[PDB]
Amino acid sequence: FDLNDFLEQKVLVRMEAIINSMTMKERAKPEIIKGSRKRRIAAGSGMQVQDVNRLLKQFDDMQRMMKKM
RNA sequence: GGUGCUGUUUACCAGGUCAGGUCCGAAAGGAAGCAGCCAAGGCAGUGCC
Numbered sequence: 001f002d003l004n005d006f007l008e009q010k011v012l013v014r015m016e017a018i019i020n021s022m023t024m025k026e027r028a029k030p031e032i033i034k035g036s037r038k039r040r041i042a043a044g045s046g047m048q049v050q051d052v053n054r055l056l057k058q059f060d061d062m063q064r065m066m067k068k069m
Numbered sequence: 070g071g072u073g074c075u076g077u078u079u080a081c082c083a084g085g086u087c088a089g090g091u092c093c094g095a096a097a098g099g100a101a102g103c104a105g106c107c108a109a110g111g112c113a114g115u116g117c118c
Contacts, residue, residue, distance in 0.1 A: 013089085013090080014090070016089070016090080017089055017090035017091085017103095018090080019104095020088080020089045020090070020103080020104060020105095021089080021090075021102095021103040021104055022080085022103085022104065023080050023103090023104060023105095024104085024105095025080075026080070026104090027104095032080090033080095036080080036081065036082090037080060037081075039081075040080065040081045040103065040104095041080090041081095041103070041104090042103090043081090043091085043101095043102080043103070044081090044089095044090080044091090044102070044103020044104070045089075045090045045091070045102095045103065045104090046090045046091015046092070046101095046102085046103090047090075047091075
């Protein structure tokens with residue numbers, strides 16, 4: 001389960017945008033996403049790092065939740 | 070080294086374009102621009118100078 005999947009799944013249009021500013025690798029191995037990349041993604045989707053982090057957090061709980069079944 | 074081809078590789082760090090999203094504007098319209106793509110570079114092999 002990676003960001004590509006999470007993507008499959010109102011303000012949902014603003015979350016797509018964020019995932020849409022990522023590279024393939026970032027979508028596949030989300031953990032590589034640190035400061036500099038967030039900086040790039042957020043600006044690339046007219047967002048803000050806090051937005052990105054939120055999205056990354058939602059994906060995380062979605063992962064952990066399935067990483068327990 | 071140059072040049073051509075092929076394989077491979079490259080988040081942002083003043084290439085082009087720019088889906089999506091963002092910004093400015095009452096609007097008409099403007100602006101920047103991620104991913105992608107193209108290009109370009111890196112690592113090699115082959116041909117030619």
